[PDB]
Amino acid sequence: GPEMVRGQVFDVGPRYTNLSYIGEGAYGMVCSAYDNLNKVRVAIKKISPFEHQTYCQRTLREIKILLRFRHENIIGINDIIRAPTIEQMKDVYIVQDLMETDLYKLLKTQHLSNDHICYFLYQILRGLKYIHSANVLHRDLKPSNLLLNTTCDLKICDFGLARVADPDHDHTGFLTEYVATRWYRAPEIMLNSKGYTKSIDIWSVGCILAEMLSNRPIFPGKHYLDQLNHILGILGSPSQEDLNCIINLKARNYLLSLPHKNKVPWNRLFPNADSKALDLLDKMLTFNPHKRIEVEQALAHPYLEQYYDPSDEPIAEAPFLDDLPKEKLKELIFEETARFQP
Numbered sequence: 001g002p003e004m005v006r007g008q009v010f011d012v013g014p015r016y017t018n019l020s021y022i023g024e025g026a027y028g029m030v031c032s033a034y035d036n037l038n039k040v041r042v043a044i045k046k047i048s049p050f051e052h053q054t055y056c057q058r059t060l061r062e063i064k065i066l067l068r069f070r071h072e073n074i075i076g077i078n079d080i081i082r083a084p085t086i087e088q089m090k091d092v093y094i095v096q097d098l099m100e101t102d103l104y105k106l107l108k109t110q111h112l113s114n115d116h117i118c119y120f121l122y123q124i125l126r127g128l129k130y131i132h133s134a135n136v137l138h139r140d141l142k143p144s145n146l147l148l149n150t151t152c153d154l155k156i157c158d159f160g161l162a163r164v165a166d167p168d169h170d171h172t173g174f175l176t177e178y179v180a181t182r183w184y185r186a187p188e189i190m191l192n193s194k195g196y197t198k199s200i201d202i203w204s205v206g207c208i209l210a211e212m213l214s215n216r217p218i219f220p221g222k223h224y225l226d227q228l229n230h231i232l233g234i235l236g237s238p239s240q241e242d243l244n245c246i247i248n249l250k251a252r253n254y255l256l257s258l259p260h261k262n263k264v265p266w267n268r269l270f271p272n273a274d275s276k277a278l279d280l281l282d283k284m285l286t287f288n289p290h291k292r293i294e295v296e297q298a299l300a301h302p303y304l305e306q307y308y309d310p311s312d313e314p315i316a317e318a319p320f321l322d323d324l325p326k327e328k329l330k331e332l333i334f335e336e337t338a339r340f341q342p
């Protein structure tokens, strides 16, 4: 009786039919489906997180943020399907707009025109402006978290690693463990930052811009410290100004121990790129997070002037935990999903 898909249970009630397997990957399993009430095809993601406290924490964060945000460039939650009781609730199904591809899949197979790069970048920054205006950090921006439909609308997804910004509590020691995807990590993550300031998102967007220009990751480090050495290989040795900002001795002395390296010019790395795009790239991939361009300045950059319109770049109406045993986490997920029950 319950709907089955390639061997596993995927019972999304009577409303969602004609399921088609889309993917998997620890985060449960995704299928497209038909929404008999709105008669559009939707995407449905099955989540089975309750067996691990980390999965429940990320599930709760994503649900709470996505339910509060409302923005054209941020994926919404259309519906949440779960059992009527906490005892019977083993999985949760998240219903979202159906998006045909993501930037990761697209960069694997397609070359982007400069007009596409410009428009995709504009929508990323437009969505990020709203996120940061809510005092939220995404913390895992990368091509696979940017969804695209057939008319080139872009929507940011996957807020499971998000945090509320906390700049006064950002400092930490050298080579401190971190969770977000290595290739998109800002250099200060490896040096002295917990990733609690808005500048770590801007770095990631700069990495995404570089990748849209070349179809390959600009800093493809194979391990934690290898990441920093890739960044320094292109940006060159940090200046005295930038090093005086790093007061932790272990991090400072690591950088001082390296042979001097000169900056590789962006136009050597991206010889086909719009020069205005490379000027913005340079400002987003600035070593010093305090000198790095902010989202509202990036939107106002000449590269984006055919789209820039601050009156059409909305902000959140209000600014926006992690110690809970999985049982009250399940209880919190149950409460947060109650509004979708019949």
Ligand SMILES: CN(CCN1C[C@H](CCCNC(=N)N)N(CCCC2CCCCC2)C1=N)CCn1ccnc1N
Residues within 6 Å of the ligand: 305, 306, 307, 308, 309, 310, 312, 313
């Ligand atoms: C030749 N124009 C660019 C073309 N565009 C695009 C834009 C509409 C895009 C819709 N996008 C959306 N999301 N709805 N618009 C009206 C927005 C006013 C601007 C200019 C004054 C300051 C506030 C922003 C334009 N005139 C250059 C303008 N200009 C001069 C100095 N600096 C800039 N940007």
Ligand SMILES: NC1=NC[C@H](Cc2ccccc2)N1
Residues within 6 Å of the ligand: 115, 116, 119, 151, 152
């Ligand atoms: N403003 C604006 N609405 C639609 C159109 C989208 C687009 C897509 C690819 C390349 C350029 C532009 N542009």
